[PDB]
Every structure is written in structure tokens, then in C-alpha cells.
Amino acid sequence: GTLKTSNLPEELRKVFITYSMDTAMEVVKFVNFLLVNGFQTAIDIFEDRIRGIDIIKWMERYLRDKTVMIIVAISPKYKQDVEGAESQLDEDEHGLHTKYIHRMMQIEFIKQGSMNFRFIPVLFPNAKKEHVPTWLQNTHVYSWPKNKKNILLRLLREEEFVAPPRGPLPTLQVVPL
Amino acid sequence: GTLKTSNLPEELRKVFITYSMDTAMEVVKFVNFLLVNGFQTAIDIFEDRIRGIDIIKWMERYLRDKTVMIIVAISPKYKQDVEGAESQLDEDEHGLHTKYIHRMMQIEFIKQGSMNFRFIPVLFPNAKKEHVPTWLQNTHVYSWPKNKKNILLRLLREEEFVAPPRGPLPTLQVVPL
Amino acid sequence: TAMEVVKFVNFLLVNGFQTAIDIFEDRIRGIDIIKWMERYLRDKTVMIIVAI
């Protein structure tokens, strides 16, 4: 085959990851995979120093930006957090932050007419298709590590299939009978 | 793997501690732990000889210096102090000094746009997350001695996790079907 | 029948028809799958080919 080089500007290489603590290790592996492949992944564990200054400001920095692609790491505990992190648990701080992020994503999704432009749900090894929040089921749900190539393609904003250019309508020959 | 020694200048090794009496028993052990690890911890009990000359000047020296990291020892009596030392606690001098320090911290925190650069809340054994003053809940909260290594890392201004360097965007190969 | 469908779409595109199929419209389809389907279901002028 032939080699194609992406023109993705560095401004469009930002990525933000939201997850639950049950999938922390696989999230670290996923972050390594994204970083080595050139994507600037913003995650709490790695930006701990900056995140400590003002946690809410740090989250809002990525939630405001329309050009940042948010990756949602789906796991059994993610749905649990975004549903009852405050009541079903003994006030888990990370769960509450994840719930806040999910609410902001939902608000943005609704205000846009229920169109998902930059939220990418990813299923992790112990996750099931039932764990995806309903509004996120209306888009491409990737699985990790199964579809990591597809995740890279999506982040690169490239088509997995190159449709050849549309040709001209065929010319018709007329024969008598 | 390979060992690492922080190149932290002795200027950045200054640490100031504010606490309440109930937690003083463990604060002594905490100060010993920090001194063993090479930090210049300034606390009233050990700085007594210099502090005796002028208590207010002694406090102001650490409050003015932006480079001095302040550790807040959170305990049930700490919130009670910083909320009602003057009236509810029969005019406790140490409580009053703690309240004054807290007010100075809040004033600086507000002046900076509600961004916390050098105030480190630490939860001591008899404390709970509810005891942390609200503005201090917006940053990392460390439990002692549960997260002592994390406290050391923070004082060293080092990241517990170091992300791999960002690579170049992957090249895409085109294969006809 | 995915592979033969890809060949069929090649055949249609080469001959000048704008074929909307999920695998090629992945970028737009990802925004809202149901809206993407309804766009072609509503339009009375879009011919639907059913690959049996």
C-alpha cells in the first residue's frame, strides 16, 4: 500500500479522559498508548500538580474547549458513579467529580440538539454494552484493547474506508429491435 | 529502576505548619517525620526561641514568603477554631493565632483568583473530610499517615506518575480492498 | 454480505451514484446514528437498496 501522513494540527491533538477507579490500571495503559502515538492526553493522575491548584478550573478547562475530544472509559463502576455516586457511596470524591463531568457532558449534548461531536465512549475489559449511558449509545462505542486501531483513527479524525471519487453517470447505447 | 535525587534548592525546602492543640500530639511526630526527610519545618513549638521575640512578625515572615509551603493540620478542633475561636472557645490564644493565620491564607487565596499555590491540607487521624474548610476542599487532601509518601512527593514538587514523552502522530497505510 | 456490499458500493460510486452506506459515512454517522438513518428514510427521492 501507500503511506498517508495526517495534517492534524497540534491544537486538535488534545484529549481528556474521564473514568472510574475500578479501571485505573487499564486507563493508565490506554493513556500510554495514546501518548506514545502522539496524542496529548489530559488525565488527573498525570496532571496532578496542575490539577491541585484548582480542580474545578482544571476540569472546566477541558469541558469548555469544543476542540478537546473527551474519552469516556466505561466500566461497571462508571455507571454506578454517574447514577448514585453521592447516595450509593460514602462520598467518593473521584466519583463525585466523574458525576459532575458526566452532567456537564450531558448538558452540552442536550444544548447542541442531542448531537455528540466530541464524546467518545470506550468499553474496557470488564465492561458490557449495557453499562454505556443511554445517550452515549447513539454513537460509535469502541472496545479496548480490541478496537484500539479504530480509536486511533477516530482521534486522528480519519475515515477507515476511502470512498473513491464519484464518477460520471454512464452513457447509454441504444440498439433497435 | 534508576534512582533519582531531587535537585530542590534549600530555598524551596521551607515548610510552615498550622494546627490545633488536639492534633499537636501527632503534629510532633509529623514534624519529626518531615525533618528526617530533610525539610526545614517551621512550627511554633520548635521555633519558640525566635518566635518569642515577636509572634506576629514570626507568623508574617512565613505568610508573606510565596515560596513557603504551608501545611494545614485538619482536626475536629481546627474547624472549630478557625470558625469561632474568639467566642466559642473561651478566648484560646493558640486558637486565635490559628484563626488569624487561616484568615490570612483565605485573603491570599481570594486575591489570587481563588487559586491555591502553597496551602496543603492534611487530614490527621481524628479528622474527617467534613472538617476541611470549603475552600481547601478544591485541592488535593492528604490523610496522615495514610498518604505520607504522597505528602513527601508533593513537598518535593514531584509527580507520582511521570507520563511518557509524547510521540509523533502515527503514519497511515492505504490498502485497496 | 459486507464484502460484496463494499464491491457493490464501488460499482455504484464508479458509475456516478452517491451511495450513502454506514461504513463510509462513519464520520457523520457517528454524530447521531438515528438522525443519520432518518435523513435517508424521510427523503422520498432517495432510492433504498436492500441487500438480501
Binding site: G1, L3, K4, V28, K29, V31, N32, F33, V36, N37, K149, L152, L153, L156, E158, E159, E160, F161, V162, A163, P164, P165, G167, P168, P170 | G1, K4, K149, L152, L153, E158, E159, E160, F161, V162, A163, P164, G167, P170, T171, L172, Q173, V174, V175, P176, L177 | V6, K7, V9, N10, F11, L13, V14, N15, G16, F24
Partner: peptide, 25 residues
């Protein structure tokens, strides 16, 4: 018109992963 203009699938050729480290004091 002949179907020579085939559809092509795009894949990322070179990739790498790992290299995460954690400080243990």
C-alpha cells in the same frame, strides 16, 4: 465504467506503547 477505482481501507502503520513509570521513593 470499470470498477478499477477500488475502495481502500486505512490503517496506522507504525505504533508503540508503554513506558509509564511510578515513583516509589
Amino acid at each position: 465504467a470499470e470498477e478499477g477505482a477500488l475502495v481502500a481501507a486505512v490503517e496506522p502503520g507504525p505504533l508503540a506503547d508503554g513506558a509509564a513509570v511510578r515513583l516509589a521513593l
